[PDB]
Amino acid sequence: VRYSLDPENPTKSCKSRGSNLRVHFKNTRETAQAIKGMHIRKATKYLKDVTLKKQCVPFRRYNGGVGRCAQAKQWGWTQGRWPKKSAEFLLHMLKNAESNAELKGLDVDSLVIEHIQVNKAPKMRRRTYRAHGRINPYMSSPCHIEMILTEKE
């Protein structure tokens, strides 16, 4: 398969992706922008803090009706929320990427996430019955996630 922004040094860079992952696209994109650029161990600690509601994810683009929290001042934003399913799924994807770096023979504690991309997937259609005998769509919007780690230390 092909990715966007292919790495400059594929010897000291590993790759991991996931398709048709039933998550929310907006929460996944916001936690991907929160995780992008970090070290791998700091990133796993950040996702465990998101799961335990200790550090938040600032919602910067998809911030419609999102309540404010105190924890977003670490990032310099007002809105903030703790996407648990998103954090767990792209924590399992960092586990897969660390396994792929171990298979390639890379240094584990020197990996920095160079690239991450969250695309939309084909929507899963369902229905909801509303007033006056009408049926409206109820669409899951899952995401494709792909990321590259690079030895940068």
């Binding site: 229905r127 006056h132 005998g133 009408r134 049926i135």
Partner: peptide, 24 residues
């Protein structure tokens, strides 16, 4: 499951409804 049919025609506005009337 079958294809849902079009929303019925709600006889909502007319002589019978006093919720909004024009000058008459």
């Amino acid at each position: 499951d079958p294809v849902p049919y079009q929303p019925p025609f709600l006889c909502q506005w007319g002589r019978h409804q006093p919720a909004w009337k024009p000058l008459m």
